[PDB]
Design an enzyme around this catalytic site. Structure first.
Site, mmCIF file in Angstrom:
data_model
loop_
_atom_site.group_PDB
_atom_site.id
_atom_site.type_symbol
_atom_site.label_atom_id
_atom_site.label_comp_id
_atom_site.label_asym_id
_atom_site.label_seq_id
_atom_site.Cartn_x
_atom_site.Cartn_y
_atom_site.Cartn_z
ATOM 1 N N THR A 136 0.788 -1.230 0.000
ATOM 2 C CA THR A 136 0.000 0.000 0.000
ATOM 3 C C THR A 136 0.833 1.300 0.000
ATOM 4 O OG1 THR A 136 -2.289 0.438 0.886
ATOM 5 C CG2 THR A 136 -0.470 0.657 2.495
ATOM 6 N N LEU B 176 -27.646 -10.796 -17.568
ATOM 7 C CA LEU B 176 -27.234 -9.651 -16.760
ATOM 8 C C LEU B 176 -28.382 -8.954 -16.055
ATOM 9 C CD1 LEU B 176 -24.377 -7.423 -16.843
ATOM 10 C CD2 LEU B 176 -26.531 -6.134 -17.219
ATOM 11 N N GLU C 33 -31.309 -10.088 -15.170
ATOM 12 C CA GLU C 33 -31.884 -10.926 -14.132
ATOM 13 C C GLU C 33 -30.999 -11.093 -12.927
ATOM 14 O OE1 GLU C 33 -33.577 -14.151 -16.248
ATOM 15 O OE2 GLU C 33 -33.803 -15.322 -14.394
#
Ligand SMILES: Nc1nc2c(ncn2[C@@H]2O[C@H](COP(=O)(O)OP(=O)(O)OP(=O)(O)O)[C@@H](O)[C@H]2O)c(=O)[nH]1
Ligand SMILES: Nc1nc2c(ncn2[C@@H]2O[C@H](COP(=O)(O)OP(=O)(O)O)[C@@H](O)[C@H]2O)c(=O)[nH]1
Ligand SMILES: [Mg+2]
Lengths: 416, 40, 218, 434
Positions: free
Chosen positions: D178, D251, D253
């Site tokens: 990070t 997609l 649904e």
């Protein structure tokens, strides 16, 4: 990508030449500019510090001194053939007067330097910024060096400005006006640099004499420490990785407050992973004469070099923060970043370099301020500073700025 | 070759007088917070 | 709980779009007929996520008051809203939704075409036979699957010949649904067609025909 | 049909995109020069897997993808690699000065200089679509480009692509590495993107790192190892979109039945099985389904046992029969306690994509005959946000690093606006856990 290196004055050019000697050997560049290395790791990020015409790598280095004698000594050196001859900007008369460097002789020369800077910057796809080596106790490296920073800053305000500033010590140099020069320069560095590595002659002298048991240290002995530190701190920039890979990512991760950009560099050895980790945070290994245990770390970067387990480095680094949690700012989570490069420096198999943004750096500034105030209260030698154009108020402003800097470090040292 | 001055500011008093011994023979500046302006 | 229903009905007018969509979903689960008129107003909501929840809730309650507003929700910009409305129309089963659902079979969105096909079979209206026969030739296997199933569910003989062609589909689930739909239709039209397939037909189509004549005797 | 443009932003986005398209090519039988010998139509093909690849007149199958970075280094590797001929050169777009881990540089000062070219290239891509269903946006939360340029792009897409669904595969930061300011970029990007996103799948790099060490016995996982695992998960999600099948869930649904509620659109993904190649018997539908509820297999460090479910979707692939899924789901309901919210509809949505999981040759994963990806919208995800918010709070309270952002075209008030939005999101998760 490209970094433009500039070295100014006696100290600046001596440590600068040593830097190029050290990184040239690591990158396989011989004194004729030919590559003679046996690894592709060497030439991965070679363009950061070297220009190419093809069969030759030339340091992107600009050499400046008001005293001509310095360019002669560097040209006579081993690598006093790699530097492009047109990049040497020499005057005729130098004399440890900051005002002559910043306003007089130095100002008369600065535009010719900027012409070379401009010419180098034209042949760079992505100029990262500038790296300057100089001392703060002198007149050229200090006065002209900070003039160059200010002029370059206003010509290139979108580029990172980095310096390796050599803080003076009365234990090394007999010049009485060095506190004035150092204070005037620190005022410039506070406003115009993004990151300054404080190389303290006080700490270098103490290391050679007390730790290295050298009873007769020379500037060459001090400079051996400087070069080993300069090579280590730039490892991130010179080889592939991800941690502090360019000057801007480094500054974004090392500088929480704009004025608090003065770093304390450390080095080990002066040789296991636990040993390198522990010795790196030891006051005896700091290149700034400040006890880190007498302050807190805002941000830290550590570069390990050599064949070692990145798993064991992670274990040891997690451990050093755990054990010394009291010494790190609790309000900057994960404030210690680690980089591990496979190529060790010449003569060592394992080594590590520390770069800390510690509030303990205030001890160095207090030392310079105490000396400056002792001189300034008696108005000692002010005449030959104001006699070169300079205003008395610049002394007052520099002193107050440095005392403000000290108080900011103290404020964050005691903060929640 | 290192040429050391230091013992503390007593070297300063000794040099203020040593400077007066040589006599016996015979510009706009950066302001505080000017760099901070770059963060606006 | 009556006080709970009244609380969710007021939440349908909250400034937050999250509060409004949760209330529409909660009202569908509760299923009180008091929420029918407020939920029909929520179908005209500025946010699609709220319109879709309101449409779904109306199918759950199943009040015929919502048939005309849900038919309008079938021509909605958001496909989640048209899916939720087509599903609700089939659930309520009002045959006023037959012509709108027939047009929804030609929808750009696969989820809508599948849901409209199964909603047409739930209603079981004979009007949907010709449009569902054309849905058997759909580009998507899931739409062909629901169209085959719906044709069986309706049970009109016009679908026999197109369902026999679906026994030769590329998708295994479609072929099985077509075979089940042929069995569901039954009768002399299917029996005579299975007799032909049992001698001429090949593969799964032949297998289905031979199995049909085994279980359909005297 | 329904086309989908993939956008890969920054180093993480681009490097993950490389892993995804390398896998998509293998799954579909597309060679690195774009040729699919398999394709019957040369001006097209089988126009089902055409959702992700357009087809040239020469018979070349080109990804409907854009790769964007502020620095050229990453994308220059794509331009000179094994797939240098798979993508169009104008689909690879690179600036010269990266965002230097600064959201403000990515969104304002540097990002501006590339945004118009990116949108022009998306407008060109959109023209070659029969019916664009939406975008799949891959990016890191921590980077200056992944956070700043993604937010800027998402804002611009909303003007004339608003009606299209936008899904994002986002890399949630973990320090083990990070940049100190990653929590700032993470909160900033989540706040600005929230209103212009339909669903966001977070992938915690620490979770993927730990799966590599434990399940694949990789002592020091590289981003390659991480990306290969992530791409297997991405593939399972998008398989319904690239493969024709009666049991595959479209997609519309899936997005409607997993994120029906507006702000709370962050599902937890769990993938199983993750097996080392070094090892191996066969895992049943019940065994892989059981593994979906073990915290070791989660893509984000979290405990769904401490939260309430709002929705759950199971995406199977391979030798999986519906009746075996129904039996496995019935079993887990009698052992595990899957607590759903008191207003949400209970039940699992199941999609079965017939083509089994493909492994990249050399990759540390074993080839399995069946695999599953569970997507569950649980309130437990608030734990992950709380972690990010807390780190943001510590630094922001002292205004640490804030100057970098305010000097790069951003107002300081945007930090508090972004943070207040996150605090509201945390409260939203508490409110549904009623
Ligand atoms: N999974 C995964 N994570 C990655 C990858 N590359 C970087 N990351 C993570 O992403 C974060 C760094 O952000 P980056 O995406 O690299 O930055 P960027 O988007 O290029 O933005 P700039 O660096 O500012 O130009 C860290 O948390 C990394 O661990 C990758 O290929 N895969
Ligand atoms: N570390 C180091 N310090 C030096 C060296 N030479 C001079 N110094 C320091 O540099 C300062 C003298 O000023 P300098 O820049 O060298 O001279 P100028 O050319 O007139 O500017 C003092 O602080 C000295 O201690 C050197 O080679 N190494
Ligand atoms: Mg990057």
């Amino acid at each position: 990508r490209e970094i433009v290196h500039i070295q100014a004055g006696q100290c600046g050019n001596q440590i600068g030449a040593k830097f190029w000697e050290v990184i040239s050997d690591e990158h396989g560049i011989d004194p004729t500019g030919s590559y003679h290395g046996d690894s592709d790791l060497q030439l991965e990020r070679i363009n950061v510090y070297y220009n190419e015409t093809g069969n030759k790598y030339v340091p992107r280095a600009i050499l400046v001194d008001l005293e001509p004698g310095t360019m002669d000594s560097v040209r006579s050196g081993p690598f006093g053939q790699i530097f492009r001859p047109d990049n040497f900007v020499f005057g005729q008369s130098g004399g440890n007067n900051w005002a002559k460097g910043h306003y007089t002789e130095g100002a008369e020369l600065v535009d010719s330097v900027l012409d070379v800077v401009r010419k180098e910057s034209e042949s760079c796809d992505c100029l990262q910024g500038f790296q300057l080596t100089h001392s703060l106790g002198g007149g050229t490296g200090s006065g002209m060096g900070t003039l160059l920073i200010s002029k370059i800053r206003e010509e290139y305000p979108d580029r990172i400005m980095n310096t390796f500033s050599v803080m003076p010590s009365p234990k090394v140099s007999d010049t009485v006006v060095e506190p004035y020069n150092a204070t005037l320069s620190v005022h410039q560095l506070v406003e115009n640099t993004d990151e300054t590595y404080c190389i303290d002659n006080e700490a270098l002298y103490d290391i050679c004499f007390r730790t290295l048991k050298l009873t007769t240290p020379t500037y060459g002995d001090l400079n051996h420490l400087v070069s080993a530190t300069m090579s280590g701190v730039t490892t991130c920039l010179r080889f592939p990785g991800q941690l502090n890979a360019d000057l801007r990512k480094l500054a974004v991760n090392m500088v929480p407050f704009p004025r608090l950009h003065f770093f304390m560099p450390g080095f080990a050895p002066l040789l296991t992973v636990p040993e390198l980790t522990q010795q790196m945070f030891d006051s005896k290994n700091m290149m700034a004469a400040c006890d880190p245990r007498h302050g807190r770390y805002l941000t830290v970067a550590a570069i390990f070099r050599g064949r070692m387990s990145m798993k064991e480095v992670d274990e040891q680094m997690l451990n050093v923060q755990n054990k010394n949690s009291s010494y790190f700012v609790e309000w900057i989570p994960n404030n210690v970043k680690t980089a591990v490069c496979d190529i060790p420096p010449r003569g060592l198999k394992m080594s590590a370099t520390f770069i800390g943004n510690s509030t303990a750096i205030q001890e160095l500034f207090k030392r310079i301020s105490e000396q400056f105030t002792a001189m300034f209260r008696r108005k000692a030698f002010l005449h030959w500073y104001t006699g070169e154009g300079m205003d008395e108020m610049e002394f007052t402003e520099a002193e107050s700025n440095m005392n403000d800097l000290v108080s900011e470090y103290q404020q964050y040292q005691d903060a929640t | 070759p290192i040429k050391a001055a230091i013992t503390f500011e007593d070297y300063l008093e000794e040099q203020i007088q040593l400077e007066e011994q040589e006599l016996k023979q015979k510009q706009p500046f950066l302001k505080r917070g000017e760099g901070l302006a770059r963060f606006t | 709980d009556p006080e709970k229903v009244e609380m969710y009905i007021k939440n349908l007018q909250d400034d937050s779009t999250l509060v409004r969509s949760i209330a529409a979903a909660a009202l569908g689960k509760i299923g009180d007929e008091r929420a029918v008129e407020p939920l029909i107003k929520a179908l005209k909501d500025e946010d699609s996520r709220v319109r879709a929840q309101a449409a779904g809730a109306l199918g759950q309650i199943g009040d015929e008051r919502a048939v005309e507003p849900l038919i309008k929700a079938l021509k909605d910009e958001d496909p989640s809203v048209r899916y939720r409305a087509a599903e609700a129309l089939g659930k309520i089963g009002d045959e006023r939704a037959v012509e709108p659902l027939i047009k929804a079979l030609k929808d750009e969105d696969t989820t809508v075409r599948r849901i409209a096909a199964t909603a047409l079979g739930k209603i079981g209206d004979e009007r949907a036979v010709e449009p569902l026969i054309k849905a058997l030739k759909d580009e998507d296997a899931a739409v062909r699957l629901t169209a085959a199933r719906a044709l069986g569910e309706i049970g009109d003989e016009r679908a026999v010949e197109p369902l026999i062609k679906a026994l030769k589909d590329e998708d295994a689930y479609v072929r099985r649904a077509a075979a089940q739909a042929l069995g569901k239709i039954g009768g002399e039209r299917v029996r005579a067609a299975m007799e032909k397939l049992a001698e001429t037909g090949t593969g799964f189509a032949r297998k289905v025909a031979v199995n049909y004549l085994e279980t359909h005797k005297s | 049909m329904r086309e989908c443009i993939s956008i890969h932003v920054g180093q993480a986005g681009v490097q993950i995109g490389n892993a995804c398209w390398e896998l998509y090519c293998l799954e579909h039988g597309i060679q690195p020069d774009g040729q699919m010998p398999s394709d019957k139509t040369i001006g097209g093909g089988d126009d089902s897997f055409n959702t992700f690849f357009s087809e040239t007149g020469a018979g070349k199958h080109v990804p409907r993808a854009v790769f964007v970075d502020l620095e050229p280094t990453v994308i220059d590797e794509v331009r000179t690699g094994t797939y240098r001929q798979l993508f169009h050169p104008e689909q690879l777009i690179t600036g010269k000065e990266d965002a230097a881990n600064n959201y403000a540089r990515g969104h304002y000062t540097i990002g501006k200089e590339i945004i118009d070219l990116v949108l022009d290239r998306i407008r060109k891509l959109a023209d070659q679509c029969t019916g664009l269903q939406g975008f799949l946006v891959f990016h890191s939360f921590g980077g200056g480009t992944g956070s700043g340029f993604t937010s800027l792009l998402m804002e611009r897409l909303s003007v004339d692509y608003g009606k299209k669904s936008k899904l994002e595969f986002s890399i949630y930061p973990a320090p083990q590495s990070t940049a100190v300011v990653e929590p700032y970029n993470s909160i900033l990007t989540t706040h600005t993107t929230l209103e212009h996103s339909d669903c966001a799948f977070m992938v915690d790099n620490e979770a993927i790192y730990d799966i590599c060490r434990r399940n694949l016995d990789i002592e020091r996982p590289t981003y390659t190892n991480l990306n290969r695992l992530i791409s297997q998960i991405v593939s399972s999600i998008t398989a319904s979109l690239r493969f024709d099948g009666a049991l595959n869930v479209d997609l519309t649904e899936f997005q409607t039945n997993l994120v029906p509620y507006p702000r709370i659109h962050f599902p937890l993904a769990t993938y199983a099985p993750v097996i080392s190649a070094e090892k191996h018997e066969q895992l049943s539908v019940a065994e892989i389904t059981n593994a979906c509820f073990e915290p070791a297999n989660q893509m984000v460090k979290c405990d769904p046992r401490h939260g309430k479910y709002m929705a759950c979707c199971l995406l199977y692939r391979g030798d999986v029969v519906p009746k075996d899924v129904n039996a496995a789901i019935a079993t887990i309901k009698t052992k595990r306690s899957i607590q759903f919210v008191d207003w949400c509809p209970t039940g699992f949505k199941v999609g079965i994509n017939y083509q089994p999981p493909t492994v990249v040759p050399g990759g540390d994963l074993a080839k399995v005959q069946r695999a599953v990806c569970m997507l569950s919208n649980t309130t437990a995800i608030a734990e992950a946000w709380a972690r990010l918010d807390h780190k943001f709070d510590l630094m922001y309270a002292k205004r640490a690093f804030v100057h970098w952002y305010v000097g790069e075209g951003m107002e300081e008030g945007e930090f508090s606006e972004a943070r207040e939005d996150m605090a509201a999101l945390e409260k939203d998760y508490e409110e549904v856990g009623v």
